[PDB]
Symmetry: C3
Amino acid sequence: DLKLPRQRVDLVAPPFVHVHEQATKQGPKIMEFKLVVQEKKMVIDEKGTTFQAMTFNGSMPGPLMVVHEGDYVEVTLVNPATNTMPHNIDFHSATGALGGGALTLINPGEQVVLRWKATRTGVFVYHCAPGGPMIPWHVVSGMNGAVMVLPRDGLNDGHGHSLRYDRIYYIGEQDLYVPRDEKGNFKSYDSPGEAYSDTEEVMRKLTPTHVVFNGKAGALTGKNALNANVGENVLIVHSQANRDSRPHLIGGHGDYVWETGKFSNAPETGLETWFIRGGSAGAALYKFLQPGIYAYVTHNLIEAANLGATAHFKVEGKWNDDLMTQVKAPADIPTGST
Amino acid sequence: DLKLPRQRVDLVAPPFVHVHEQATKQGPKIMEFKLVVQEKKMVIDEKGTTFQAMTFNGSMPGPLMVVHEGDYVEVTLVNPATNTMPHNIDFHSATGALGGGALTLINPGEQVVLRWKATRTGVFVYHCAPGGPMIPWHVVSGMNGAVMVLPRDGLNDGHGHSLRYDRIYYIGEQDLYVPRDEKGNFKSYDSPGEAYSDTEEVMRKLTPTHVVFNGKAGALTGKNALNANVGENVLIVHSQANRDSRPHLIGGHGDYVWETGKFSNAPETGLETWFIRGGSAGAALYKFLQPGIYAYVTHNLIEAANLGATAHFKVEGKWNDDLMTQVKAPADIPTGST
Amino acid sequence: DLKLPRQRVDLVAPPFVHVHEQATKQGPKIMEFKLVVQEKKMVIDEKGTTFQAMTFNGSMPGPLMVVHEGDYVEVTLVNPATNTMPHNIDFHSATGALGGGALTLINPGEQVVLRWKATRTGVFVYHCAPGGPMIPWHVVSGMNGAVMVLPRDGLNDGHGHSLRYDRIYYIGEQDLYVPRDEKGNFKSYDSPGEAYSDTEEVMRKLTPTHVVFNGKAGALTGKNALNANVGENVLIVHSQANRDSRPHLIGGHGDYVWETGKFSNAPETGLETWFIRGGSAGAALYKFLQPGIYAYVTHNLIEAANLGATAHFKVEGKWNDDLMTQVKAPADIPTGST
Ligand SMILES: OC[C@H]1O[C@@](CO)(O[C@H]2O[C@H](CO)[C@@H](O)[C@H](O)[C@H]2O)[C@@H](O)[C@@H]1O
Ligand SMILES: OC[C@H]1O[C@@](CO)(O[C@H]2O[C@H](CO)[C@@H](O)[C@H](O)[C@H]2O)[C@@H](O)[C@@H]1O
Ligand SMILES: OC[C@H]1O[C@@](CO)(O[C@H]2O[C@H](CO)[C@@H](O)[C@H](O)[C@H]2O)[C@@H](O)[C@@H]1O
Ligand SMILES: OC[C@H]1O[C@@](CO)(O[C@H]2O[C@H](CO)[C@@H](O)[C@H](O)[C@H]2O)[C@@H](O)[C@@H]1O
Ligand SMILES: OC[C@H]1O[C@@](CO)(O[C@H]2O[C@H](CO)[C@@H](O)[C@H](O)[C@H]2O)[C@@H](O)[C@@H]1O
Ligand SMILES: OC[C@H]1O[C@@](CO)(O[C@H]2O[C@H](CO)[C@@H](O)[C@H](O)[C@H]2O)[C@@H](O)[C@@H]1O
Ligand SMILES: OC[C@H]1O[C@@](CO)(O[C@H]2O[C@H](CO)[C@@H](O)[C@H](O)[C@H]2O)[C@@H](O)[C@@H]1O
Ligand SMILES: OC[C@H]1O[C@@](CO)(O[C@H]2O[C@H](CO)[C@@H](O)[C@H](O)[C@H]2O)[C@@H](O)[C@@H]1O
Ligand SMILES: OC[C@H]1O[C@@](CO)(O[C@H]2O[C@H](CO)[C@@H](O)[C@H](O)[C@H]2O)[C@@H](O)[C@@H]1O
Ligand SMILES: OC[C@H]1O[C@@](CO)(O[C@H]2O[C@H](CO)[C@@H](O)[C@H](O)[C@H]2O)[C@@H](O)[C@@H]1O
Ligand SMILES: OC[C@H]1O[C@@](CO)(O[C@H]2O[C@H](CO)[C@@H](O)[C@H](O)[C@H]2O)[C@@H](O)[C@@H]1O
Ligand SMILES: OC[C@H]1O[C@@](CO)(O[C@H]2O[C@H](CO)[C@@H](O)[C@H](O)[C@H]2O)[C@@H](O)[C@@H]1O
Ligand SMILES: O=N[O-]
Ligand SMILES: O=N[O-]
Ligand SMILES: O=N[O-]
Ligand SMILES: O=N[O-]
Ligand SMILES: O=N[O-]
Ligand SMILES: O=N[O-]
Ligand SMILES: O=N[O-]
Ligand SMILES: O=N[O-]
Ligand SMILES: O=N[O-]
Ligand SMILES: [Cu+2]
Ligand SMILES: [Cu+2]
Ligand SMILES: [Cu+2]
Ligand SMILES: [Cu+2]
Ligand SMILES: [Cu+2]
Ligand SMILES: [Cu+2]
């Protein structure tokens, strides 16, 4: 019945994004994606703490899907028989049937194919939602990602000017709720099911033990810092499926920010810190002006420094002393000072 | 002195709203409302937990009041002698005297009459605020509602087009702080006064035990789901007098959202999730496009699924397979799959 | 190399603000400021609880700095030898080097001079950020303030009309994490270093013990209420370097609100409650219409009434009975009432 060209997309692991066009002259297509659920124990912090994760495509977050307004998105969701739980998928980009969740519940050993029309532009969360208490549990165990629906003319500034990014990164933020024993040490389990009761008790108190980008503390620091160059316009997509976040690029700004994440709304300009509502994605464009290390955080600095929620950018280029300079390096306070 | 027509409004219990006009050609009126304080033990969750509530008009939230810009609102607040505490009312819609609180403190057995001019458009919180620590306590015990001040021309999209709703629902969200005994069981008390000291200790840790719509977990699910039809434009007013919330309509969107709640500002379009600041009301318009069950949540999914904060809509009509379809029902993963 | 006039600014203690022009016809200048770090024990609540604070200029918040777009800001940061810790400064207004933090680390006995160009308009946080876990610790110990970068034409309403304030106040909100002993009493320490381990444990649970304006519960109540007069347009700058806040003026509104704090964006109009993202500053203009006491709160009322986060305004002038009046004072409920 639906007679449009089909195009298979190969997803890539975050924080990278599969290749796509910004502006396009192609008409609507059926864009075909496959997501495979993987339950697995994962390391989440720099001390080696593990937890019983549940993922799309083996990553936290799940991969970013990119389509254009008016495309149809045909998703094959696979639940391998090595998994233990039923899973499904809810797309906040989609209309009807609980975002798709009501049409995609699959037991281990099954797969399902859902199609939804990309009628709404922006970045959106997708997440597992099997029903009842299993909804938060699957989400905070890692089963969430995002999809971006671009306008066919690409981004604009809300004032008639095109905006184009040179690079795009997807930062998925995950609140985790890892049980502790009586002495405070994190507990380990042999399966997600065995971890559930203790995990739910932590969840109920609404205070995460970890808040991480790309699935673990330090994931996007060190050798996995995000690269850019002075002069490049970088789009930073940020999602949080369960809990608020307040992104901030230390040493930079958000030149154009869609904090509610929806491209039918003009962006705000020149933000220091923006706000991702739990259950949403947002996006910020920034043109780097200075080289060096930048930290990208949630600006609850306790979360950023002590719970895991810091990423780095490493930016190559020449320093601009007009924008900032060290006029005088550290020196003894003058004896004459009053 | 004030020589305008008077009109008595009969309030109705949430989530329903008393009858009103959107656009009106009537001039300003004195709109007369009565609110009666009721302290009573109420059931707040599906396990039967009770707590010592304090309400306007016997409901959590208090009822939605609807007037138009330039009306005067004359409120008789009654504190029956069967109550134990003084009460008052603060309207965030009003100007002066702590929103009215400084003019409306009444002991059991008394009533008072306040008039305020509706100079500011939007949805607004009203709440009790007797002074000092009694302010949060009365609010989180249930004494809060909302008022909507419509423009006389009704709503608009901020771009010169009228917006009209076919149905309106008021979702009041309440954070509750129910004491527990040493084993974790919720405690019961014979009066609000007896509950206070233990409740204040829970409040101080800023983590609710329950987060509910319309006064209890499951209030707006099952037989009390909210009705709509495909094609209807529904206004969903959401308030939270004490704590942030992040509304989301699962399977839908916010077509036009005033998350800060004030109609002098253009709405945002096409939101997945919006944000109600504690101490405010906001509103979202959505035109249903698909039949079926929708969940309406705060998108902290722990709160939604495990603390009480889920409502349902039941929407009648025909399914649109263009917007979404199950291409292939659950099936065994092909043996040929790699 | 940089050949512009220099102008030394003398800072003043919050909530007051050093003298400045709104609109200016002066060209860019190098605006010279000095900040001196002071570690000291401070009283934070009305029961006399102390904690080991760390400050810029002896105050929480640090003082508000005011410049205009295109000025250069040359900051001498001094770390006296009576201090125990290294310190630095990050300006969210600045571009590069982690906002300046990477160029300003000074040990006790040292000073440093940083210059940054004020290319971005708005109110912005500044804060200490020495590295790693020391970043949140220094911030939540008090080392944060704000800077305002005005447009050279002063404020506007985003619709081509100038806005001018008659008075400006800076409200810095501070979340504090004071350790308790086994009985719940707050602990005291002889130095910040000695307090660190116990403080970090409180910080990790993300629940402050105190939330205060101008450095202590009750700081801006009583004899230190903020003054205004009916008819005056007052700008209220609000910052929070670590944690969200939801400002509300009880009995008033935000006539023009930049909740994200950046003057390149039009303000929202007629807000009841606004939202300061942790790690940012915002600003609200309000023209007082009624005399009397106003409370200015974060509208988590538990925080406001029970954790310290209430300020007062005392507004002189004549009452306007058209906007609000007590039609009938408290009286016995009629025996005839049903
Ligand atoms: O002996 C506990 C000690 O070992 C580490 C090793 O990196 O991790 C183990 O224990 C953790 C806490 O139970 C588990 O999360 C993990 O699966 C297990 O390898 C340390 O983190 C831990 O302190
Ligand atoms: O807005 C994007 C997309 O949403 C649709 C529904 O699929 O329309 C919605 O939004 C419109 C514009 O705000 C409303 O006029 C309409 O009533 C609502 O359904 C598409 O028609 C539109 O392209
Ligand atoms: O946090 C409580 C208490 O637990 C201990 C181990 O007994 O450390 C645990 O908690 C720390 C904070 O989350 C972690 O860094 C560590 O991996 C974990 O074992 C104590 O050291 C701490 O005091
Ligand atoms: O890119 C940052 C990096 O560049 C160096 C020189 O290689 O210094 C530049 O950046 C500094 C600010 O971080 C400037 O103060 C300096 O003048 C400029 O040359 C490195 O020192 C620095 O890590
Ligand atoms: O015996 C306790 C058991 O009874 C229930 C009945 O629905 O409720 C009682 O106890 C609750 C906890 O103290 C009270 O909140 C309630 O008022 C009382 O009827 C169960 O909820 C409870 O587990
Ligand atoms: O804005 C609605 C309503 O507010 C009033 C005060 O009652 O005016 C306020 O807002 C105006 C428009 O932003 C400001 O110009 C004015 O100074 C401020 O008091 C009414 O006059 C107006 O209709
Ligand atoms: O939550 C702590 C602990 O308390 C118990 C009873 O001892 O259950 C209580 O708490 C649950 C979570 O809020 C409620 O569902 C229940 O109504 C309440 O009695 C334990 O079951 C729980 O482990
Ligand atoms: O309204 C939802 C309701 O309608 C039924 C048919 O009575 O199925 C419709 O809705 C489904 C999506 O929820 C579609 O997949 C289906 O094609 C459509 O007929 C019920 O099964 C469903 O509960
Ligand atoms: O004896 C404790 C008692 O004294 C007060 C006096 O105002 O403060 C002391 O103890 C506090 C808690 O340890 C300290 O914060 C403070 O430095 C010290 O003077 C009371 O607050 C306290 O309850
Ligand atoms: O926007 C204020 C200020 O920012 C600068 C950079 O210092 O420009 C940024 O913002 C511009 C307008 O949004 C973008 O066009 C530009 O690419 C970005 O660097 C200044 O040029 C501008 O005055
Ligand atoms: O809060 C727990 C418990 O501690 C006590 C003293 O044992 O009071 C402390 O905590 C109160 C709340 O923060 C403070 O008002 C007081 O300054 C502090 O000592 C108990 O009174 C309270 O029950
Ligand atoms: O400014 C508030 C202050 O003024 C007094 C008279 O001196 O009363 C005025 O304000 C009241 C509202 O707070 C009005 O109801 C009254 O009509 C008006 O005169 C004081 O009573 C009040 O504290
Ligand atoms: O180690 N995780 O259960
Ligand atoms: O059904 N999911 O665990
Ligand atoms: O400026 N960053 O914390
Ligand atoms: O049962 N409530 O006190
Ligand atoms: O005074 N109110 O409890
Ligand atoms: O999409 N709702 O959780
Ligand atoms: O008393 N403060 O450590
Ligand atoms: O290095 N600062 O404690
Ligand atoms: O209206 N103030 O809580
Ligand atoms: Cu799942
Ligand atoms: Cu969702
Ligand atoms: Cu009350
Ligand atoms: Cu209020
Ligand atoms: Cu410091
Ligand atoms: Cu910062």
